[PDB]
Design a protein around this ligand. Sequence first.
Ligand code: ZN
Ligand code: ZN
Ligand code: ZN
Lengths: 70, 66, 18, 814, 81
Amino acid sequence: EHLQSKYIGTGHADTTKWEWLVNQHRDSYCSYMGHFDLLNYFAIAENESKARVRFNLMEKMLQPCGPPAD
Amino acid sequence: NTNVYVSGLPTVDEFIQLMSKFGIIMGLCCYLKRESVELALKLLDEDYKLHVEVLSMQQKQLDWRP
Amino acid sequence: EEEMRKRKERVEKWREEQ
Amino acid sequence: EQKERKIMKLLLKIKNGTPPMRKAALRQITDKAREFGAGPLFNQILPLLMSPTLEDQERHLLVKVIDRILYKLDDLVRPYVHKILVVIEPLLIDEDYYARVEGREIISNLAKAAGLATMISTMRPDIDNMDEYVRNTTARAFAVVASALGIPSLLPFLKAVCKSKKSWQARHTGIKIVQQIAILMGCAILPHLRSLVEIIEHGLVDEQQKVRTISALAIAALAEAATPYGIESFDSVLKPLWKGIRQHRGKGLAAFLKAIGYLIPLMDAEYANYYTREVMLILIREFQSPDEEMKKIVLKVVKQCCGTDGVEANYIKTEILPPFFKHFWQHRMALDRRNYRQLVDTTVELANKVGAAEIISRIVDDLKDEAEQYRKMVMETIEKIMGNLGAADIDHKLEEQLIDGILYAFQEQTTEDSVMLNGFGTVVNALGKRVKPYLPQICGTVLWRLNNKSAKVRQQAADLISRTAVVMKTCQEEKLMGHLGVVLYEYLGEEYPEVLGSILGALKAIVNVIGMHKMTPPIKDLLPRLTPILKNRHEKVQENCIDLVGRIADRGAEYVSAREWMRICFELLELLKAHKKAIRRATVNTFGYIAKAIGPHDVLATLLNNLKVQERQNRVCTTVAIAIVAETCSPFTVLPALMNEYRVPELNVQNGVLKSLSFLFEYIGEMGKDYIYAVTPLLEDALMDRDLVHRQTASAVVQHMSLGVYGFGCEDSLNHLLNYVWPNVFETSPHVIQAVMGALEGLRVAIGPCRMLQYCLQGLFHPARKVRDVYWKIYNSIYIGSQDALIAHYPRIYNDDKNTYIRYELDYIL
Amino acid sequence: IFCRKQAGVAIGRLCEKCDGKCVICDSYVRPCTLVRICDECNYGSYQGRCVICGGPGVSDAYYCKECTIQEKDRDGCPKIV
Ligand SMILES: [Zn+2]
Ligand SMILES: [Zn+2]
Ligand SMILES: [Zn+2]
C-alpha cells in the first residue's frame, strides 16, 4: 500500500538485489549501533575501541555493498 | 413445520412486531426457518397471558455476506 | 405518622434557637 | 493585473475544495510571493482578514498563508508594516482565544520578517497616543514583538520609554509592555527577570498615580509568571511596596496589595513571616472596604499569604480568622457570584492550613440561617472542606451542629439544589460510622422529601439515597433501607424518566446494601415491575434498570425462575449493541450475571437457535452474547456446542459459528490458550472450504486467536494454521484479502517475524509480477512491524563480482 | 483515510454513538492505549472532534489491546479524514 512509502527500507515488485541488500546492511549497522552487547562482541573480536567500531559502522552506512549494479 | 398458532392475543400491527423477535417472518404465523418455533415455544408462551402451539432474497436475509 | 410531626419540629426548633 | 486575478484563483483554491488543491495553491502563492510583491499581495489579503464573514478555519488557513509569504517576502514588508499592523492589532484584543493566538502568530512572523528597528519606528508614535485603547493594543503588539525576538533586544527601547520624562502616557505604556510581556511569556521570563524588574522599579516611586498603579501591576505579573522562583530579582521593589502599602488608598492601593500577594509565595519562610505581618496591618483595614474590586484583591492576598509555608497556623487562627469571619461570612456576601466563588475558595484554603474544625465551627451556625443563597454558600464551603479533609478533626458537639443544620437546610430549600445534595452526601459519607445516632432523623427527612409532590424534589431525595445507602447499612438497616425501598417501589411507575432513573439508581443502591432475603418489596415483586422498564427509551432509565436487574441476577439469582431469566436475556440481547456506551456496559455485565443464574447450557442452546434465524443486526448481537457466556461461566461449555453447529451442512449456520468464534477469541483474550488445539480442526475445514466468507472469517478467527495467545506458547498450532492461511494470499476479493492480511499481521506477533520471513523469501523475486506485488505487500507489513528483529533472520546472500552481500561482523567468533 | 501526521500532546475524543470503539479497527473490545492526535486536527473547530466521525467528543478515544500489541498506536494521528 502507498503509506508503506513513509517507511524507508520497504520494497516493491521492481526492487533489485542491490536495493534490498543495501537496506539489510544499513538496518544491520543501525541495529549494531543500538545493541550495546552486539557492539561489545565486535569490539572484542576486532580488538578495537567501541568508539572506533561505531565510527567504522557509520562510515560503512554510505556504500555498504559497493556501487549500484549499473 | 414453521407455522405457529397463538392465543390470548390483545392487531396485526402488534402481532408481527411481537413475533419478529423470534426470527424472520415471510392468530397464525409463518417463520422462514424451523428454529423460530423452538424460540416461540420457549419465550412467547406466557409473555394478558400469551399462549402458543405448533424466495431467494428471503433466504438471503439469513446470509453472512459482508 | 412521624414524618410531618418531625418536619414541623425541625423548622420551629431553629426559629426558637434563633 | 491578471496575476492579481491568479491570487484570487489561488485564494479560492485554498478557501474552497479538496486539501491537495489548497496545498498546491499555497505552494504556488508562496514561491510566487517575490514576484507578486508585498504591496499588491497585502492590499488583497488584508480585506479578507478584515471581513466579518470569515470563519475561524478560513482565518486559520489564511494565517497558514500569511506565515509563509512573510517568510518569503522578508525585508520586502518594511514599507507596509504600518498598514499590515493596524489591521492585525485588533485580533490581540478579540475575546476569541483562537482569533487572539492567530493575531499573535502573524505579529510574530511579521516581526521575524521586518527589522526590529522598523517595528519600533512603526509602533513608537502609538506609545505617546492619548487613547488608552491605542496604548493597550500597542502594549500587546510590543509584547508579541518581544516574544518572537529576543527579550534582551527590546530592553534598550524599554529603558528609554520608562524614563521618557515628557509624557506619562509613554512611561505608562512602557510599563504596560513590561506587564504584557510577563502575561504572554510565562516562566520564560525568569532569566530576563531582574532586567525587567530594574526597568519598572522607579515607577512604584513616581509622582503619577497611573504610573504607580501600572508598575505595581507589572510587578504582580512578573511575580505571577516567575512563581515559585526569582525572589532575588524583586529585592529592589520590596521596600517601595511597603512604603506604598502604608501610604496609598483606593484602587491605587489595591494594585500594591495585588503585587504583594504574588510576591509573598516567592519568599523564604522567614521573609514570608516578616512580610505577611507587614501586610495584615493594612489588609485587615481593607476588609472594611466598600469596593468590590478591593474585596476581590484582599481575598486573593489572604489566599496567597495563608497558602505560603512560613506563616503560622496559629498566626492565621489568632489574627486572620476573627476579622475575616466578621467581615466576609455575613449575608451580604452571598449576593454576587464573583465574590461568592472567591470567598468560598479563600475559606477552603484557610481550612487546608488551620484545619477543618476551626473553619467549619465558624460556618456551621449559619447552615440554619434564613437566606437560601447564604445557606448555599456555607453548604458549598462545608462540601469542599470535608471533601478535602474528612471528618477526623470534627468534635462530637460539631457533628450535632453540622447534622442539625444540614437537615434544616435540606428541609428548607424550596427548589432542588445540587449544592444541598452534594453537601448532605459528602458530610454523611465523611462521617460514616459516626452517623449512626442521627440515622432516624436523616431517614425521616429523606422519606418526607421522597413523599413530596414535586418530580424534581423526589429526584433529589432518590439521588441522596443513591449517594448514601452505604452509610445507612450501619444498623436497623433492614428496617430503614427496606421502607425507603418500598416507597421507591411505588415510584417505579414514574411519568418522568429523569425521576425513574433516580428511583432505579436508589433501588440499585439498596440492593448493593441489603441481604436479599430481607428485601421489603420481595424480589418476586421487584423483578416483574422492572421487566417493562427495560424497554423504556430514556438512557438514564435503561442504565439504572439494566444495572439493577444485574444486581438481582448477581446477588439474588434463586428468587426467580429459569424461564423468567431466559425471557430477560432475550430482551437484553439487542442492548449489547446499543449506541450508548453506558447501556452496552450495563447489558454486558448483567447478561454475564444472568448466564451464571440460568447456567450456560440452555441459554447457549437458545442463543445458537437465534443465531440461525434472525437479521444481521440481531445475529451479530448473538455473537456478542455467546462470547459473554464463554468469558463468564465456562468457555469449555460453549465450544462443544459451536463445534456441533458447524457439523450442520448449511453455509449460513456454518458461517454463523465462524463469526461467533471470531468474536469469542477477540473477547476472551488470554483465555484462548486452553482452546486453540480443540478449535484448530474446525479452522482447517473452514479455511480449506470453497466459500469466500468461510475463508474470510476463519482468517479473522486466526487473527484474534494469534493476538490473544501471544507469549503463551501454542506456536505449533499457529504454524499449522499458517499452512492453511498462506494459500489464500492470492485471493482477489477485497474482504477475503484484507482478512488474510489481518491474520498474517496477527501471526507475525504470535509466531514471530522469522517465520513470516521464511514464508516470503521464495516470492520476493519470483518471475511473475502478480506474485511479487503480493509478496512485497506482505514483506512490507512484516518489515514495518519488526524491522530490528529481521536483522537476525535474513538469509546468507553471497557476494557478486561488483558487490559485497555477506555480513562479516556476524561471522566473527569469540 | 487516516491522517498520519506525527501525534502530539492532544488526546483524541469520541462522540456517544462511537464511544468505546477503536479508531483503527472499530472493535469495542478491551480499550488499552489513549489515542493521541496532531495539533492541526485539534485546533479551533477541529478541537474536540470525534476521531472517527468529527462529532462533539463526550469521551477519550482508546486504541484496543490488539492494536496496541501490533504497535498500531504508533503509525501517527488516527483522525479519519
Ligand atoms: Zn483496534
Ligand atoms: Zn491529524
Ligand atoms: Zn463519532
